[PDB]
């Protein structure tokens, strides 16, 4: 989460540890996102960093435009698949994992977002709100 994050986030079940690959859900040219780090994660001997909804991760693009591969970029997790539980009591989950590639400040490379988006992420990242269709 961290920098450019408008607001705070309540804790939600970590679903994507390092090495998870999530669908790329914008129109940027990227086909998938390989997670290499989670921003603002902590440290425990042997613990893998892991991200959830509306987390900023460092990532690379394993399938996609050549102009987008072989390099690390920031990105933001928008769909999860591992069920988490909101404070309104509900356990909910998506059918896939997906983020969109972003710049440190949280602005998006691509113009649109393809597929639904978690509310807890629209809430966090205004530029992501913008480009969404269906939220949560």
């Amino acid at each position: 989460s961290g920098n450019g994050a408008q607001g705070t986030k309540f804790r939600i079940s970590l679903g994507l540890p390092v090495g998870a690959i999530m669908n790329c859900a914008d129109n940027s040219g990227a086909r998938n996102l390989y997670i290499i780090a989670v921003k603002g994660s902590g440290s425990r001997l042997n613990r893998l960093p892991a991200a959830s909804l509306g987390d900023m991760v460092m990532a690379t693009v394993k399938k996609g435009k050549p102009e987008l591969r072989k390099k690390v970029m920031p990105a933001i997790v928008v769909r999860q698949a591992k069920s988490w539980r909101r404070r309104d009591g509900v356990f909910l989950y998506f059918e896939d994992n997906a983020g969109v590639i972003a710049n440190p400040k949280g602005e998006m490379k691509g113009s649109a977002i393809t597929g639904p988006v978690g509310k807890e992420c629209a809430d966090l990242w205004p530029r992501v709100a913008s480009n969404s269709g269906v939220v949560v």
């Binding site: 607001g7 705070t8 309540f10 404070r87 309104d88 009591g89 809430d123």
Partner: protein, 48 residues
């Protein structure tokens, strides 16, 4: 005795769940009146 679930609006200016419902776990303990049958008086000593 046991646990169950509760629903209540939460009141906490500043939070993202201000004036929104939450669902919360509660325990229940069975509590019929206790009955008084004695008094004991303690005094202080340098040994406690």
């Amino acid at each position: 005795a046991g646990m169950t679930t509760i629903v209540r609006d939460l009141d906490r200016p500043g939070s993202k769940f201000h004036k929104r419902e939450v669902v919360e776990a509660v325990t229940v303990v069975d509590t019929p009146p206790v009955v008084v049958v004695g008094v004991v008086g303690y005094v202080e000593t340098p040994r406690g």
